[PDB]
Amino acid sequence: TESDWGKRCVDKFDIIGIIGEGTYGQVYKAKDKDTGELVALKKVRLDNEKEGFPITAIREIKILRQLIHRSVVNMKEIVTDKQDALDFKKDKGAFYLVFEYMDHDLMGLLESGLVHFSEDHIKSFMKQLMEGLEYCHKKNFLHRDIKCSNILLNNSGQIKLADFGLARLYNSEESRPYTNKVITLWYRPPELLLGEERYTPAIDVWSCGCILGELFTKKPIFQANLELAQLELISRLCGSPCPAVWPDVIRLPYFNTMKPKKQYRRRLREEFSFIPSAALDLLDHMLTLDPSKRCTAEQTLQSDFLKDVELSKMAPPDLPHWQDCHE
Amino acid sequence: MSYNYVVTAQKPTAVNGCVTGHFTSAEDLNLLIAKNTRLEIYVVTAEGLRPVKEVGMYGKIAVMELFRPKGESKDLLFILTAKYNACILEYKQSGESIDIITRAHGNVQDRIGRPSETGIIGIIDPECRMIGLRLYDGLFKVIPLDRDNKELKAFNIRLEELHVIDVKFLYGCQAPTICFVYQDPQGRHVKTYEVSLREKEFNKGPWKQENVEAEASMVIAVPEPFGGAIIIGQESITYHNGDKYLAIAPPIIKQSTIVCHNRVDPNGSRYLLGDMEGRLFMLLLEKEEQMDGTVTLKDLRVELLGETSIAECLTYLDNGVVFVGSRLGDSQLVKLNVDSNEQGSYVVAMETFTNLGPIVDMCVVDLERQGQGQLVTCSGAFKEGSLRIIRNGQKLHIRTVPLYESPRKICYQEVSQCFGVLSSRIEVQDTSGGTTALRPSASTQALSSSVSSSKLFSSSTAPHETSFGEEVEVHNLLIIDQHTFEVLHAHQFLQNEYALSLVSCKLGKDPNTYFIVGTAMVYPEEAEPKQGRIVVFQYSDGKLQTVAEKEVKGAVYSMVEFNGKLLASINSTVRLYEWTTEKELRTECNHYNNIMALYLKTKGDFILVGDLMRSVLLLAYKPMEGNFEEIARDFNPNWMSAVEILDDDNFLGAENAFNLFVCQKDSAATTDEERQHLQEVGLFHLGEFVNVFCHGSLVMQNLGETSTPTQGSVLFGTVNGMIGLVTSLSESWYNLLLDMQNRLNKVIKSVGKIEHSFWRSFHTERKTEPATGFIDGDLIESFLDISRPKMQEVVANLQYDDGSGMKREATADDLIKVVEELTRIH
């Protein structure tokens, strides 16, 4: 049946080529020989055999067979290398996680400078991204690695969230200790920079706000190399962590250790004055320092900016594919 | 890691801006001409220009303006670079010693902002109270020009109008006032605001907004006798001042877009206007004085003067002599006469300044069997299109072959003693239903001619409607004699067929040498071409014969000969064709993992593929199997402009951001994943747009030249005419030259106090990285021009390593020898 994963062979796919270096293996583009469908294959190597099958991949399998949303990436099956099978011990072939192929990734589209986002385009992008995050958050999962590289876009204008390798379940009642260095510094929440080991789903909201601003500037908002420098850059724009705006900031491991140069005022509305009013309010609420005062995903979907966006009009982003060749 | 060296063989030749003023002395009339990264200072004489000084800046010159604040005897110069380095400069001369003073400087970049569509705009107040900068959508930056602002500190005023087309400071206003055309969903409008340094905000401007032409392009601030502003569009010119409103819409200007303006008469009575078909107009302001004693603008008139080069900038100088600064063709001095000549023209050319123009392609060929090498370039555009033959002999000798249409690709075919050149010319839909060319050109003045009769796409049934007056491109293959550069033949391709790629080669067991062209069927409706041809021609006995055609489902962006097979890239696909004994192309194998395979290069059985957004890929032919294999890909996202193979392991690429990079196979080889990773080992901000990489050199390499430390030779052509050279170094030589750069940067004084390390840092809107693996040869070659005290300072404590001596002290005369050798590679 369709459900007996792990037995079908990778012979069933014509490999087209390598599209990226993953975490637990390389990622290939391939075409199904039977249906002609295009797929992405994440290769999982258990030959490391220090901890066997990678937990990163286990998370992605465990979670993505539960999550069904148009804005969440779909795992179609798990297939295997041709096994000599003289003995199960001799077998060292790898496993492949079969996903739907997506035309582009957001980082590629922005880094190549080949995309222009209108307001109406940003609405479609953000409505889908927040709706998918809402589905995950309402199902009590945290992504914990939201970056432009992990938001995939096909030319239909459909957005899908993708790298669930760092995803874990969140218990609101019983707080659990997690890993504090979870998101890439550019998209990391301020709470985790100050060492919050018991973090909330608000970490993902922060990342998406960073993307919201970036789509309006085409440059990442907070680009730094070290955790302190980011806190300064965030503080310069969002305001310095003070107990006035973040009453429990005093309870964070590195609050006294890590301080911005000054006590900064919030200038988000000034430095982002070129953003539409409806969007600026979304950014100010999403990039709120205190995770407990930071808006939820649902609250973003019930905003003047995204509430009345209709996803029937997907409004794909503008990609030049001719006259880009010659100026 | 990899070590490479990059030098300039020909400096940028395109004029990017020109101003006139009193910069060198309060007495002389100066002409300041800006080429990319280069500033040229001239003094106006009765015969022409007297050059006085040229400086380089560590930045692309984006804004250039002269101002004279109260208290200064002479004009000061403001320059802003494309990386947002701002400075105020002064000319100072002590007898024979000429130097440029940096009076104020700083970087005005904002942490947050969206770069505007119409680019950086910089303007200065008529009272020189402030400098206005339009860098980002929705923001206006003010650098107030107070004596104390030596760091050029500035503040931003929120600007409600996000999409600004153009802005100028107006004359005759009680406060500093800006006039700007902007675009919102309701069309384009002209609006005015007053700028308050005291309040650091806008106040309501003097005259109300008016709705203007949908394609309103340029704003002119008219001098105080009239006051107000003139707005130039595609069809109309309008003057707005207070309640006064005029509009002239003469049919002559609708024919070609007007791109430049300049004031002839300081009272504002007369202006020059230029258009993209090269026409030069006079815009006349007709005065009417009232009995009150006030003078009002009565009417506007436009008069055609003649023809110049397609000009980016105009400057009137004086005595009827105008400077035509070109980016697409040669620049000029032209004289405007009061009386027309017998042809009806008031314009007569005086001098012609060479511009290698846009270099769309080029090849190196030893025409005279002199073992030297000559560079034949596809240069210029539209009526300025030309071939340029460049040889060394101390200056470069450049011959110009006018084509009067756009050259696209060039390739040399020795067997036929001629060149093949792809070209396109503009025709316009005319009342016959066909099209008519605006002027004769190479593809119409060929000795013999032919037209494709291919039936491949003739089925059609796809409607493409035509409106009178619309432009079309008509593409041709030109056969051009290598000694006379006469156009021997011209082959016109199908209607709406673009010629994109050209090779000259033998295939298979076929002894004939063919010209092969790859094309694309371009319809306005299509996002990406879905039809195309590979055409095999034979040039024989003065006629071009069509040997074979292969239909493809896309655009043949790039082709290259591959061990007797034809390697072609069709959209995402990279294909290898064999040439059968039946003289037809047969597909052997394909590689599909691309977004758009724009560029191809080969070495042996290895192929380097340049993609629109996915950087460069190393593909390989496996002859035992008859297919392709992916050796390694650069996973850093980059928008490629050109690529080249340096050696079996190092690969050179050019970015659309004016950056260079070198990739190398990791070659660790522990795991397959590392091998499939091309590591970016070289990063370098060139500052030019590279269209073509080409292996070769123009230096006389006949037996007897002393061995150079540099190994290899890649020449490259750019949009601004700049020609450069990339070569490799040994680890020892790099470290020496790199250590010497760091010493030279401490010693050499930069114009605008721009840090050299900043200038060459890899730069996109999203990233900035320090340069690596690249020696700025132009810096190294400046050691020979610095004063002796500075030379010994540079060589102090300089220890050579990894050589005959592990530690070797360096003297200045030793480096004078090394740098002089490094100047002999070009």
Add this chain to the structure above:
Amino acid sequence: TKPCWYWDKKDLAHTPSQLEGLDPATEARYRREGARFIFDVGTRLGLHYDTLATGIIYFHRFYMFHSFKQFPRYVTGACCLFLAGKVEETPKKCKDIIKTARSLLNDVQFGQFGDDPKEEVMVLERILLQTIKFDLQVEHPYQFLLKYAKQLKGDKNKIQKLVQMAWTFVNDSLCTTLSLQWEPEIIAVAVMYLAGRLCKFEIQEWTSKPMYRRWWEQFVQDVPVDVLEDICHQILDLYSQGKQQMPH
């Protein structure tokens, strides 16, 4: 889409183990021993109750597809616990599971791990994953015992006694093939039902429908008493066979 992980009791007469000549009593014994091994090993390592149960469910499912004569049970158990730890985010290093398994197993039993215990376990992970068809997410009776008990209102102490007694019945049912016969929701109800009979409690009084005598129908739709009674019978059988008695 998703696989079916439930069989009918009658089907257990045809496991690979049975068809290789193992009798029903022996396979049942092997299942108890393997499960209790998993339980004991993970408890020594401090593992959450869900992690123990997940391993046990993997283990029970595994021997619906393979024979106990070809896959030594304690190796399989150790492998299942190792994977369960990664699935449930309570990871343990394989060397630590082996160390604990050696502490708890005698010399004969630890013979199953062969000359290289860690290798025998790590190698099996591939077969385990393919066997359980990469369906890693598992629900257990515990979460439903609590979800349903929370909706009971009445004597705090009588309900807590019901929960603890039922919880013990859940732990005990992991030694049986009930995990393979009935969804966890049904197990949770069955154990509540059993505890109610044993403690002489009438659970309907604690529900929002106190005159709805089939109190479980508002928690689990379509469950006949036939099922709950069958489950109760199977749980108490473990107590009667052993020397142990009902907790009460």
